């Protein structure tokens, strides 16, 4: 139920709580594992643009420690593109949650970032909330039929879902079990140049508070 | 007047149909993999990786919130990849074979550019051929146009592979997975 007409006043900000999609993964490398995220870039400023939407650009960076993982809200910079700072959960307000690019590292000819990789993710939706504010592209006219009276203002249709997690069993773990590198996938079949290795994990089934 | 609302369920990482090889050894038709006309048509549908990141652009900024100071977009991004491996195969062209391909298609046999084909071997009827340049009883003059393809009305994602072949497999992901299957 979302009744017509609209009830509230000037500001109607809320306090809520959610969780994330469970994600286990594991990597092995001699070069550090790269990754990407969606971030802003420059536009074409000679065309008289009807809307002046911020263009988007892919950025293959290198993963640091302490950078967050995808939380179901996509792999973007929330630092500069969420100007209101108040639509994602607290921890992801001022950073960028990167995500790996498997199909790039595999296509590198020397193959010195993947010896072995595994992943498991699952996610569904629990509730449904709509955002507030004025739509950038309001809906064009020939897909609906107007009304009169309490149907005066079109409701702002910025819908966003909430991630929900799932059950987490112990049959579907990924740790405390060994892994023998019988054959790597690239060309570097286990050789660690420069006398260093880079393992990385992101685990979020063991994250109690 | 009832209608329900479908939702769908959890999306695992083991119920996927992508990021995997698929070898073929027997197609379900009599076409065992051959692509006449030197094109394919690959089509995929996914609804599992269908997130909707949302933007936020401001109007005027100060540390006391008003909901009209911001104006938001909704955007959505999807990418893909394709990889292939092909195999050279020859057709011996003798007398009893070009009669078979002729009944399937005309456009195949002309596109090897080795000859032309009279479409009948003649017909029986007179077909009432006029010569007097059209001033007596009107007929349908039917000017032809081959139009060079039938699919040009439609719109696809055209990708090109004219400059992306190779002869050495093992410098690519698919070659290193394919060669471990065959043992070569």
């Amino acid at each position, epitope marked *: 139920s979302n009744r017509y007409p609209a009830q509230p006043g000037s500001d109607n900000r809320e306090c809520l709580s959610m969780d994330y999609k469970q994600t286990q993964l594991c990597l092995i490398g001699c070069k550090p594992p790269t990754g990407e995220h969606w971030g802003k870039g420059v536009a074409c*400023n000679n065309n*008289a*643009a*009807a*809307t*002046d*939407c911020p263009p988007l650009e892919l950025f293959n960076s290198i993963i640091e420690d302490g950078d967050m993982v995808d939380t179901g809200f996509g792999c973007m910079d929330f630092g500069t593109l969420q100007a209101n700072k108040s639509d994602v959960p607290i921890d992801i307000c001022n950073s960028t949650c990167k995500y790996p690019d498997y199909l790039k590292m595999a296509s590198e000819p020397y193959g010195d970032s993947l010896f072995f990789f595994l992943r498991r993710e699952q996610m569904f939706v629990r509730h449904f909330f709509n955002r507030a504010g*004025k*739509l*950038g*592209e*309001a809906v064009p006219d020939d897909l609906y039929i107007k009304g009169s009276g309490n149907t*005066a*203002v*079109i409701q*702002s249709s910025a819908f966003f879902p909430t991630p929900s997690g799932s059950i987490v069993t112990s049959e579907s773990q990924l740790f405390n079990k060994p892994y023998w590198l019988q054959r790597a996938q690239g060309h570097n079949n286990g050789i660690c140049w420069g006398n260093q290795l880079f393992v990385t994990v992101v685990d979020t089934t063991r994250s109690t508070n | 007047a009832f209608f329900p609302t479908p939702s769908g369920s959890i999306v695992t990482s083991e119920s996927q149909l992508f990021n995997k090889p698929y070898w073929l050894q027997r197609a379900q038709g009599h076409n065992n993999g051959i692509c006449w006309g030197n094109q394919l048509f690959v089509t995929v549908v996914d609804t599992t990786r269908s997130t909707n990141m949302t933007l936020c*652009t*401001e*109007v*005027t*900024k*100060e540390g006391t919130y008003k909901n*009209d100071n911001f*104006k938001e977009y909704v955007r959505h991004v999807e990418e893909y990849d394709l990889q292939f491996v092909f195999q050279l195969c020859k057709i011996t062209l003798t007398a009893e074979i070009m009669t078979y391909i002729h009944t399937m298609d005309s456009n195949i046999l002309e596109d090897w550019q080795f000859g032309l084909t009279p479409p009948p071997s003649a017909s029986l009827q007179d077909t009432y051929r006029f010569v007097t340049s059209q001033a007596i009883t009107c007929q349908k003059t039917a000017p032809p146009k081959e139009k060079e393809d039938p699919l040009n009305k439609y719109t696809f994602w055209e990708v090109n592979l004219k400059e992306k072949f190779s002869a050495d497999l093992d410098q690519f992901p698919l070659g290193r997975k394919f060669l471990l299957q065959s043992g070569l």
Partner: antibody
Amino acid sequence: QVQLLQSGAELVRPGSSVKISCKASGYVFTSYWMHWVKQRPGQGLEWIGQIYPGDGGTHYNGNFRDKATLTADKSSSTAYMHLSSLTSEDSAVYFCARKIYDGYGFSYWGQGTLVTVSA
Amino acid sequence: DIQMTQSPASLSVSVGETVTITCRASENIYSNLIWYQQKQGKSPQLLVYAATNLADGVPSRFSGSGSGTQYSLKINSLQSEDFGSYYCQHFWGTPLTFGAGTKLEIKR
């Protein structure tokens, strides 16, 4: 190409109501807030309000409260202001305001509209 | 409202001098100022946005400065295309206020 047309001169009577309008093109009209302004002759500009064509959410100035009725129309791509019971101290020039989609300041203006009250 | 105190009322200047218009408000607005140019019989035109950043088409004689409650714009080697009437505009607040207006006049 973006443009804001405006009628330049407008002669009226004091105590009556006048319908001032400006025309919008070159962009999509429902994606921008619109503002109107008043430069008192021998004074700086005065900002009067803030209006959106998409929903119709209005905003006025308290010193213009009940003085102007901000309403628009989306079919002919124009916005209106309509001063009620006009007096002599609002004999001035007027523009309607267009910012960038970001919206710090007003990038394009109209032409101007000077109003005079007499018998 | 936060009212703006633009000074001077005018200035007589010739070509080449370094000029400065005072622009002062009541509250700490955080560099959200716009300066403008009006000639006679004409409409205003965008010069600088957010008190440091120029919008397109303009020469580099204009340079913005200041933080806190005070801001001023600097033009070196002022030219004949710059003569007109000016306005410095802050843009936080219900309601938005503007500059007092200086008519940039010629020296003789």
